[PDB]
Design a protein around this nucleic acid. Structure first.
Ligand SMILES: O=c1ccn([C@H]2C[C@H](O)[C@@H](COP(=O)(O)NP(=O)(O)OP(=O)(O)O)O2)c(=O)[nH]1
Ligand SMILES: [Cl-]
Ligand SMILES: [Cl-]
Ligand SMILES: [Cl-]
Ligand SMILES: [Cl-]
Ligand SMILES: [Mg+2]
Ligand code: NA
Ligand code: NA
Length: 326
DNA sequence: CCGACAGCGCATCAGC
DNA sequence: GCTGATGCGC
DNA sequence: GTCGG
């Protein structure tokens, strides 16, 4: 946190652009600016010293100069005072409600937690669960809790079928001391890029996790992706753990390294890496890395046997998960 | 300038 | 019912 | 909002 103030300001700017102006590129520019300034190993002394970083342009440079001078940003003062903005911004904190739905509620005059609660009949399922656990979802997960959750998830998966491999990814895999949610990569040998020799693969696991009351709620669910709610069991007389977001992603087993690379993140590191891929003439997704032909179209999956081969293809030295926290 | 800016699964709706 | 577009999240 | 060509 050499520049906690600056990166905070840009995050806020990013959030405003995304949630209020629905200007998704401004949002990503601000987020890239914050990321790169966050790993910059010096206390920034000026807008111009910042301009030197890539992703920091002129507009962001003046803003940073303004911030270093006054301790703030007037553009943000105004935004904070603007009732309709703060309301829309607030509503997009409920899982399942984004910039559009938030703006639509605020039009109807639904602009607070109280308002949301008494208009529940107006929410889709996801939004309704998001609201249920609003408070809990605001809380981070200490890694110590993640270790307990991991041990539950992996042991219950092994119980359904010892063939499953479940790998906790996301910020946990990058060694963070706390995580927003839990992201779990799932593989079984019956599901490859060549075939689905068994159905319900994800269902079974979800079912087993619900049966032991680990999974309490479902936000959305398909054949290969689950997003719902879970809870550590508490002890006698013991106060309950908060409810936690959980993602479970079933990926073809012969496509694990591309899968674990994707799910390990961070989201900004994934973006940078994939952008660099395109520059090298490749496209990377959670399944494969493919070459782009002159025409532009993606070719056939290159052979991959380690996270590192993907790094090799695009001429990046390997970065351990802990160093992918952008 | 000016186009590109990562990639995609699931829920919901429109239009048929 | 379907596909295609959009919203929302990982 | 920023950047590469
Ligand atoms: O826009 C996204 C979002 C997520 N992802 C990936 C990478 C990421 O680490 C993973 C899990 O997504 P999260 O939303 O859980 N972010 P993360 O786990 O890295 O941080 P945290 O959970 O601690 O808030 O899925 C993307 O590639 N693009
Ligand atoms: Cl934009
Ligand atoms: Cl400010
Ligand atoms: Cl792979
Ligand atoms: Cl693919
Ligand atoms: Mg996570
Ligand atoms: Na720059
Ligand atoms: Na939200």
């Amino acid at each position: 946190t050499l520049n906690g103030g600056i990166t905070d300001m840009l995050t806020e700017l990013a959030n405003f652009e995304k949630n209020v102006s629905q200007a998704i590129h401004k949002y990503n520019a601000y987020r890239k600016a914050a990321s790169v300034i966050a790993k910059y190993p010096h206390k920034i002394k000026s807008g111009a010293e910042a301009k030197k970083l890539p992703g920091v342009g002129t507009k962001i440079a003046e803003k940073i100069d303004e911030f270093l001078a006054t301790g703030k940003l007037r553009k943000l003062e105004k935004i904070r005072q603007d009732d309709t903005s703060s309301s829309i911004n607030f509503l997009t904190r409920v899982s399942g409600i984004g910039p559009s739905a938030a703006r639509k509620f605020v039009d109807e005059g639904i602009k607070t937690l109280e308002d949301l609660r008494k208009n529940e009949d107006k929410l889709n399922h996801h939004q309704r669960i998001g609201l249920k656990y609003f408070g809990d979802f605001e809380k981070r997960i200490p890694r110590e809790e993640m270790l307990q959750m991991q041990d539950i998830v992996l042991n219950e998966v092994k119980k359904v079928d010892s063939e499953y491999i479940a790998t906790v990814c996301g910020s946990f895999r990058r060694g963070a001391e706390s995580s927003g949610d839990m992201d779990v990569l799932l593989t079984h040998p019956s599901f490859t890029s060549e075939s689905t020799k068994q159905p319900k693969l994800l269902h079974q696991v979800v079912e087993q996790l619900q049966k032991v009351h680990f999974i309490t709620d479902t936000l959305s669910k398909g054949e290969t992706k689950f997003m719902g709610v879970c809870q550590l069991p508490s002890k006698n007389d013991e106060k309950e753990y908060p409810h936690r977001r959980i993602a479970i992603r079933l990926i073809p087993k012969d496509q694990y390294y591309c899968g674990v690379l994707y799910f390990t993140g961070s989201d900004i590191f994934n973006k940078n890496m994939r952008a660099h891929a395109l520059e090298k003439g490749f496209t990377i997704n959670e399944y494969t890395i493919r070459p782009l032909g002159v025409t532009g179209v993606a070719g056939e999956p290159l052979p991959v046997d380690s996270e590192k081969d993907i790094f090799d293809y695009i001429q990046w030295k390997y970065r351990e998960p802990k160093d992918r926290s952008e």
